[PDB]
C-alpha cells in the first residue's frame, strides 16, 4: 500500500471500525476528483486504496466520515468530518499512513511517511 | 466572540503567531461562501471574526493556513492546511473556540462550545 | 501566574471543571516534595498555584487526577492520571501553561512557555 | 503480546526509533517495581515486554524516555519523559497497545484495548 488509513476511537480505546473514508485528487480546475474509498476494517485500518502506479504526485484529500461514526455510537459529535489534505510524493513515492485519533469534540491526524 | 480561533506550536511550545485563518459558510446551493478572515495575534488568538447577529445557523469551515506557517520557519510540513468543518448554532446561539495544535506532520483540533 | 494548568474535556467540548491537580518538586534526595495543589475552575483553569519567588529552578511534576474526573461522569477511563514532568526555569524565570486535553482512553498535554 | 508500545514522531512523520521504554508494576508498598523494558524497533514498536502468564491485574506504569529521543535529534524537549499509568486487566486479560505521539512540547497517549 502506498496509502493506508488508520482510525482510532479515543472514547472506547479501540480501532474505529466501519468508518467511511473517501480519497480525492485535486483536478487541474481546482475541484476534487474522487480517487478511492472504503471503510475501515475491524482493526480500524483501510488498505488497498490505490497502487503506486496510480498514486502519482499531486494534492490529495482524505475525508473521514467521523460524524456517521459517532452517530452510530449514539454520541454527539462536533465535526462534520475530518479532512486531511496533503501534497504526495513531492520527493518520490514513499508509503503514507494517515492516522486519525477521534474524540467527539476533538481529533488529531498524523502522517507516518516511510521508505 | 461567538467565534474565536486559537493556534499553538507544539515544536516550540508557543502561540502560533500570524497564522492566516479563513472562514466559510455553506450556502443554499452547497457552495462555500467566504464568511470571515483574519490572522492570529501574538497570543496565538484570532478574535472579532464575526458578531452574534451575523453568525447564524449553518455549516461553517475554518481553514487554518498551517503550511505557510511552517514554511516561514524553514519547515516543509505534511499538511496543506488544517480544516475544521462543523454545524453551528443548531440548538441556539453558542460561543465556539476552535483550538489547533500544530506539528509539522501532525495536528489536533478541539472545539470548546459554551452557552 | 508563573504556573497555570488548563484542562479540557474532548468528549463534551467543554472545560474540565473541578479537576484536582497536585504539583511536586524533586528534592535534593530525589524524592518528590509536595509543592502546590488546587482544582480547576469553571473555565477549566487553575491559577495561583505559586509565585515567582517560590517557583525556583527544579524538576516539577504536575499530576492531574483525570480518573476521578471521568468516574464522576460515569466513565471508567484507561489512565489513573495524567502526569507532566519537566525542568523549570533552567535558563531563567518563565511562565508555564500546562494544557491537558482529556478523553476516556487518551490524553494529550501541551506546554506553552513564555518569557 | 498482551502489552505493546508504539511511538510516533510528529515532527518528522515517522516511527520513533530506539526510544527507551521502561515498564513498572506497583508493589504493595506503593513503590514502582521494574517489570520489563526495551527500545522501540525501526517501526517504532516494542513487542514481547511480558507474557499473559506474567501480566496479571495491577497498576502499571509505562515510562517513555522522550527526552533522550529529542536530545538525539538535536531538538529541545519540554518533558523529562512521558508516563502512562493504568490499571490492567480489571475485567480480564485483553491486549493493550499503548500508543504515544511525540512533539518536543506536547505528547498524546492512547490505549487501544482489544480482545
Ligand atoms: Ca497496507
Ligand atoms: Ca474573543
Ligand atoms: Ca436548528
Ligand atoms: Ca494566571
Ligand atoms: Ca540553570
Ligand atoms: Ca506484539
By residue count, chain A amounts to 115
Residue where the block lists cell 505528547: D107
Is-contact C46 C16, C-beta < 8 A?
Answer: no
CB nearest to C87's CB, from D80, D107, D113: D80
Chain C residues touching A104 at Cβ < 8 A: 10-13
Residue B23's Cβ-side half-sphere holds a number of Cα atoms within 13 Å equal to 23
CATH number for the segment(s) A1-115: 2.60.40.180
Which residue does chain B place closest to A91, by CA atoms? B76
The H or E element spanning position A73 is helix A66-73
Residue C100's Cβ-side half-sphere holds a number of Cα atoms within 13 Å equal to 29
Whether residue C91 is annotated as binding a ligand: the answer is no
Torsion of the alpha carbons at D8, D12, D18 and D19, rounded to the nearest 10: -50
Residues 6+ apart with CB under 8 A from C39: C18, C19, C20, C21, C46
Longest dimension (CA), chain B: 44
Is-contact C42 C15, C-beta < 8 A?
Answer: yes
Structure determination technique employed: X-ray
Which residue does chain A place closest to B65, by CA atoms? A85
How many beta-carbon pairs below 8 A join chains B and C?
29
Start-end of H helices in C1-115: 66-71
Distance of residue D42 Cα from the nearest chain A Cα, in angstroms: 10
Whether residue B83 is annotated as binding a ligand: the answer is no
Mutate to test the interface with D, among B73, B76, B103, B104 (most CBs of D within 10 A): B103
Interface check A103 vs C, CB under 8 A: yes
Residue D27: count other Cβ atoms within 10 Å of its Cβ: 11
Chain D residues touching B78 at Cβ < 8 A: 13
Is-contact D42 D17, C-beta < 8 A?
Answer: yes
Cβ <8 Å between D80 and C85:
yes
Which 3 state secondary structure label does DSSP give B69? Answer: helix
Report d(CA A58, CA A62) in Å as an integer: 13
Which residue does chain A place closest to C79, by CA atoms? A13
CA–CA distance from A33 to each of A29, A58, A62 (Å)?
10, 12, 11
Please give the grid coordinates belonging to residue B40.
Answer: 492570529
Please give the grid coordinates belonging to residue C72.
Answer: 464522576
Please give the grid coordinates belonging to residue B30.
Answer: 452547497
Is-contact B11 C110, C-beta < 8 A?
Answer: no
Is-contact A20 A65, C-beta < 8 A?
Answer: yes
Interface check A97 vs D, CB under 8 A: no
Burial of B34 by CB count in 10 Å (0-12 exposed, 13-18 middle, 19+ buried)?
Answer: exposed
CB nearest to C12's CB, from A14, A105, A108: A105
Q: Which protein residues have a CB closer than 5 Å to ligand 6 (ion)?
A: D 1, 4, 47
Cβ <8 Å between C108 and B114:
no
A82 forms beta bridges with A64
How many beta-carbon pairs below 8 A join chains B and D?
39
Cβ <8 Å between C109 and D110:
no
Q: Are strands B95-103 and B3-9 parallel, antiparallel or unpaired?
A: parallel
DSSP secondary structure string for all residues of D20-80: EEEEEEE-TTS-EEEEEEEE--TTSEE--S--TTT--SEEEEEEE-HHHHHHHHT---SBS
Distance of residue B12 Cα from the nearest chain D Cα, in angstroms: 6
Residues 6+ apart with CB under 8 A from A60: A3, A23, A24, A25, A26, A35, A85, A86, A87, A88
Interface check A10 vs C, CB under 8 A: yes
Residue where the block lists cell 506504569: D61
User: Pick from D75, D72, C76: which is nearest to B12 by CA?
Assistant: D75
Cβ <8 Å between D13 and B78:
yes
CB nearest to D14's CB, from A10, A99, A113: A113
Cβ <8 Å between C13 and A101:
no
Report d(CA C60, CA B71) in Å as an integer: 34
Interface check D84 vs C, CB under 8 A: yes
Residue B43: count other Cβ atoms within 10 Å of its Cβ: 12
Is-contact C81 C67, C-beta < 8 A?
Answer: yes
DSSP secondary structure string for all residues of A18-71: T-EEEEEEE-TTS-EEEEEEEE--TTSEE--S--TTT--SEEEEEEE-HHHHHH
Is-contact A46 A3, C-beta < 8 A?
Answer: no
Which 3 state secondary structure label does DSSP give B14? Answer: strand
Whether residue D103 is annotated as binding a ligand: the answer is no
Measure the CA angle with vertex B64, ends B16 and C103; round to 5°: 80
Interface check D106 vs B, CB under 8 A: yes
Amino acid at each position: 500500500c502506498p496509502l493506508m488509513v488508520k482510525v482510532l476511537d479515543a472514547v472506547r480505546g479501540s480501532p474505529a471500525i466501519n468508518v467511511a473514508v473517501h480519497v480525492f485528487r485535486k483536478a487541474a480546475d481546482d475541484t476534487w476528483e474522487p480517487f478511492a474509498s472504503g471503510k475501515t476494517s475491524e482493526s480500524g485500518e483501510l488498505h488497498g486504496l490505490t497502487t503506486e502506479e496510480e498514486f502519482v504526485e499531486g494534492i490529495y484529500k482524505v475525508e473521514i466520515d467521523t460524524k456517521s461514526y459517532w452517530k452510530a455510537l449514539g454520541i454527539s459529535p462536533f465535526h462534520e468530518h475530518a479532512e486531511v489534505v496533503f501534497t504526495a510524493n513531492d520527493s518520490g513515492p514513499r508509503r503514507y499512513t494517515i492516522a486519525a485519533l477521534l474524540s467527539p469534540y476533538s481529533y488529531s491526524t498524523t502522517a507516518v511517511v516511510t521508505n
